[PDB]
Amino acid sequence: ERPTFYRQELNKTIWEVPERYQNLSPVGSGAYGSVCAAFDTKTGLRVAVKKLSRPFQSIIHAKRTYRELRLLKHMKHENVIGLLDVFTPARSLEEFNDVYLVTHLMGADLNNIVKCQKLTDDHVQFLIYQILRGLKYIHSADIIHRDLKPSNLAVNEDCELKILDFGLARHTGYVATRWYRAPEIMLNWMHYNQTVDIWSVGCIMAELLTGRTLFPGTDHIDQLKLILRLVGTPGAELLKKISSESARNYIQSLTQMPKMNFANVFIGANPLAVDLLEKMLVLDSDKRITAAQALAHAYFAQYHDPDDEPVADPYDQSFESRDLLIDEWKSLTYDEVISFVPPP
Ligand SMILES: Cc1ccc(-n2nc(C(C)(C)C)cc2NC(=O)NCc2cc(F)ccc2Oc2ccc3c(cnn3CCO)c2)cc1
């Protein structure tokens, strides 16, 4: 049975939602959509609702819409956002033009937790453990997040964490994606692997330990300069792996920089935290630690449980290779909306 919908304007966006979702309030807004917090009067819990902006306006938007809904419908893990509800006011494919996605509202993002709580080393252990646990699951579905940063980590007052991706394309509480980006993806060095996300985790962990952005570059050139000042310039073995000629010629043109000893950078940190950082912030991603390996690191001895670090069910990404028209991406999305089944 179709719920009763109501309409409401909030910060210039028109929201049309089932009456179960009330007290809508803004969380974030950018070119691709907006997110509000609300109260779900069915369950008595707070939820976040994402409305895609004109999701079938172009091929790239239609495919993004479908990708997000496919992925959110698949994610079933404690440390990753999951889909509580997906709805449209439209009563048929013909009038389907808006998609809304619903998840459990977490207290805050990882930035706001730093303002509120004083993160001891135990807190850092627990928070990074959960990121890696969620990343192991995500990577096991052959998915790379690519956008990990503190604003994409949702945290409650109990310091329980979930990975999400706002996906709104915001630019200047601003947190730049580039500050957490591995150099090999930022500069298109080579066909990169899943451990670009581990680079991001290292940057986040560093910031949780020190209170400051590890590499706050103002553009990609300054970003790389800041990175190489810590980890040193690529040596011969890694340069040869930079298969982009333009990228390699640029790196080879820079003044060589020595690698720093992280024990002298992260003064007073748990030695095991320093050791993990040294394994995540490896320039050569063939040598960078994976999420599964990092979960086994002695830094996480208090939390690590190999029988409770689950992997994902097989995720069918054959849609990624298809070249479809807007109306075809729209119809596949509509199918996925209609087939959704709430979790129990
Ligand atoms: C084209 C594209 C775009 C994105 C993705 N993508 N990829 C992932 C992976 C699996 C890779 C991590 C996740 C997603 N997408 C989202 O995470 N979409 C956000 C979302 C979805 C909802 F259904 C409802 C609200 C949403 O936004 C929020 C915002 C803040 C929130 C919550 C909760 N707490 N808090 C903190 C404040 O209290 C939720 C894939 C493709």
Side-chain angles (χ1 to χ4, degrees):
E1 318 80 335
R2 181 187 190 262
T4 304
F5 280 66
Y6 73 105
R7 285 157 69 68
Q8 171 190 17
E9 185 165 337
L10 183 57
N11 284 341
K12 284 69 177 176
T13 303
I14 302 332
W15 294 77
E16 184 159 3
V17 308
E19 88 202 326
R20 74 184 273 183
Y21 300 114
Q22 297 283 335
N23 190 45
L24 265 57
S25 64
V27 166
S29 200
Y32 283 116
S34 51
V35 182
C36 286
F39 271 88
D40 180 4
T41 67
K42 205 150 190 293
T43 66
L45 302 181
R46 299 184 182 189
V47 300
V49 188
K50 178 167 173 178
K51 182 195 179 189
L52 286 162
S53 163
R54 298 233 299 120
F56 313 114
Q57 62 187 97
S58 67
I59 290 176
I60 288 174
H61 284 71
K63 194 176 174 191
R64 276 176 72 92
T65 298
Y66 180 70
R67 177 191 292 124
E68 184 172 22
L69 176 58
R70 286 292 307 282
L71 189 57
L72 290 173
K73 285 180 66 177
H74 197 76
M75 295 294 100
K76 290 182 170 179
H77 189 280
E78 306 169 30
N79 305 121
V80 183
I81 174 174
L83 198 62
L84 277 183
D85 195 16
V86 50
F87 64 82
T88 176
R91 298 209 207 218
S92 68
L93 173 70
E94 306 96 273
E95 70 206 50
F96 175 53
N97 284 99
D98 282 299
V99 186
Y100 298 77
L101 311 155
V102 185
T103 192
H104 177 77
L105 187 74
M106 300 288 281
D109 74 16
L110 183 60
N111 292 108
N112 323 331
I113 290 303
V114 172
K115 172 183 291 185
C116 286
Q117 310 199 3
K118 176 53 184 171
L119 305 177
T120 68
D121 185 60
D122 294 308
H123 286 100
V124 176
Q125 282 171 40
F126 186 47
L127 290 160
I128 298 303
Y129 176 74
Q130 294 177 92
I131 298 173
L132 291 167
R133 185 167 181 269
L135 264 190
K136 179 189 178 186
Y137 176 90
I138 289 163
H139 286 179
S140 81
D142 197 27
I143 293 288
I144 299 178
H145 187 290
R146 296 190 181 77
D147 307 321
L148 278 174
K149 56 188 173 177
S151 52
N152 280 334
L153 301 163
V155 189
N156 66 20
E157 309 97 292
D158 294 332
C159 271
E160 294 178 333
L161 175 155
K162 299 180 188 301
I163 299 169
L164 49 79
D165 191 337
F166 263 82
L168 297 187
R170 291 174 290 170
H171 296 289
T172 183
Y174 173 69
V175 181
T177 293
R178 92 178 146 275
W179 298 343
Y180 306 88
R181 272 267 155 98
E184 69 267 14
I185 171 179
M186 187 183 52
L187 298 170
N188 292 312
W189 279 0
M190 71 184 86
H191 188 245
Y192 56 84
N193 70 31
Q194 309 189 306
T195 70
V196 299
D197 285 335
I198 293 295
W199 183 273
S200 308
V201 178
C203 295
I204 290 161
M205 169 166 167
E207 179 173 344
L208 292 184
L209 291 170
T210 70
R212 42 159 97 159
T213 311
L214 181 58
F215 306 121
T218 58
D219 57 48
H220 292 173
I221 305 304
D222 181 60
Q223 188 64 37
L224 180 68
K225 190 191 70 188
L226 296 176
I227 287 166
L228 300 181
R229 180 176 300 177
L230 179 67
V231 307
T233 32
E237 164 191 8
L238 170 64
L239 285 159
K240 292 185 179 277
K241 301 179 195 188
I242 297 184
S243 64
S244 164
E245 187 175 18
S246 59
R248 192 173 64 247
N249 285 349
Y250 178 62
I251 299 309
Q252 270 162 9
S253 78
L254 304 172
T255 302
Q256 284 186 66
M257 296 296 284
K259 181 195 176 288
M260 299 284 88
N261 176 349
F262 290 16
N264 297 335
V265 177
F266 297 99
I267 287 321
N270 184 335
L272 294 177
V274 179
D275 182 79
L276 183 63
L277 284 169
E278 287 267 24
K279 296 186 163 51
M280 305 177 148
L281 302 178
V282 170
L283 201 54
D284 185 350
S285 62
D286 295 331
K287 303 190 172 17
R288 196 173 301 146
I289 193 164
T290 67
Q293 291 164 350
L295 287 168
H297 188 281
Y299 190 51
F300 304 113
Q302 171 82 198
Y303 301 103
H304 171 54
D305 179 354
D307 311 313
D308 188 27
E309 296 165 350
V311 296
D313 287 351
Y315 179 53
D316 188 335
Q317 290 191 73
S318 64
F319 75 91
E320 285 294 4
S321 70
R322 297 185 65 190
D323 284 308
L324 304 182
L325 304 174
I326 289 175
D327 278 345
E328 296 170 317
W329 291 118
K330 175 177 169 219
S331 176
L332 294 170
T333 299
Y334 190 65
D335 292 336
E336 290 294 325
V337 168
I338 301 286
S339 70
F340 177 73
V341 166

